[PDB]
Amino acid sequence: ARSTNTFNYATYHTLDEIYDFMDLLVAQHPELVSKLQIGRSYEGRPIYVLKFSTGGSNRPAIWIDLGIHSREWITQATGVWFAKKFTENYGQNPSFTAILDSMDIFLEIVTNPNGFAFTHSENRLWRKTRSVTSSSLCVGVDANRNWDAGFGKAGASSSPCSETYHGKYANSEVEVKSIVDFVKNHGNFKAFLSIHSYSQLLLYPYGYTTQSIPDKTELNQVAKSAVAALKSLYGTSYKYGSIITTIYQASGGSIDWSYNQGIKYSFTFELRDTGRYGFLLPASQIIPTAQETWLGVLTIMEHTVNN
Ligand SMILES: C[C@H](NC(=O)OCc1ccccc1)C(=O)N[C@@H](C)P(=O)(O)O[C@@H](Cc1ccccc1)C(=O)O
Ligand SMILES: [Zn+2]
Prior knowledge:
- By secondary structure, the chain is an alpha/beta fold.
- It contains 9 helices and 8 strands.
- The chain has one domain: Aminopeptidase (3-Layer(aba) Sandwich), CATH 3.40.630.
- It has helices at 15-28, 73-89, 94-102, 113-121, 174-186, 216-234, 243-246, 254-260, 286-306, and strands at 33-40, 46-52, 61-66, 104-108, 189-197, 201-204, 239-242, 265-271.
- The chain has an 8-stranded mixed β-sheet with strand order 1-2-4-3-5-8-6-7, sandwiched between helices.
- Helix 6 (216-234) links the parallel strand 6 and strand 7.
- The protein is globular, with a radius of gyration of 18 Å.
- It starts with 14 loop residues before the first helix and ends with a helix.
- The structure holds ligand ZAF and zinc ion.
- The ligand C[C@H](NC(=O)OCc1ccccc1)C(=O)N[C@@H](C)P(=O)(O)O[C@@H](Cc1ccccc1)C(=O)O binds next to strand 5 and strand 8.
- It is classed as hydrolase (c-terminal peptidase).
- Keywords: hydrolase (C-terminal peptidase).
């Protein structure tokens, strides 16, 4: 609250507290991290991305976003702990230091800020964005069904009131289009990780079709390796496989889009638990969850460095 060493990582925070932590972290480490505004949400909130960078021109980069689905509160909490963790380990861990010496990391902690506010002010289990339009008194688009990969196909709903509603057309949600523009204008991302909760799964492309990706052998192996690093800490068991195969058919998801843009290392994590608490994970599981998913995410970045 006036030092990120004083910040309580073991509790759930509001949007203001998280954007203030971003300002404290940048002020504490101005040579390693900066805060970029890549857009504004439907209702007018700034959308912030943190860039962690050791220098260079157009370094190969890693995208990580959290909270695209606002009720999944373990993910924005894990992202605050990640941001802090990168300024603690850089210069101490050989592995992490070697990734950041050749690559940059972009971290988006709250991808859907209006939805996250709503989960605090009115409905804890709100999933969608907050746009209103037109044709329905039902608010919101599922922002993980709004991307241009299999858009509009089976695996998303067309009624506005559905939790899985895809939107009128791809990238209709400014929260999605802001990332699409930013990743394209950068033009040198090598990995794209989108973190959700729960089911304890590590998923790779496709959700919208049963056809295997051309890179399915290599990504299945990276997923085998990341899932074993994660399990090493506390015994937490993950499954892994393509989206459509390992949880269900879904069209318009972000990782299918990034993979189709040529970002080969595209993965989504489904964090703790497997059903007991669901979206309502105890605050006493935040840091255990954050610490073992760190191990799985480090294993993916190391493989992106080496290839
Ligand atoms: C919409 C769904 N609703 C729900 O009630 O989930 C129940 C459930 C429980 C256990 C297993 C499966 C589903 C839900 O919130 N799903 C979550 C499990 P989550 O939002 O993390 O799933 C992700 C999966 C995904 C990942 C990449 C590309 C496409 C799809 C998602 O729906 O976006
Ligand atoms: Zn989700």
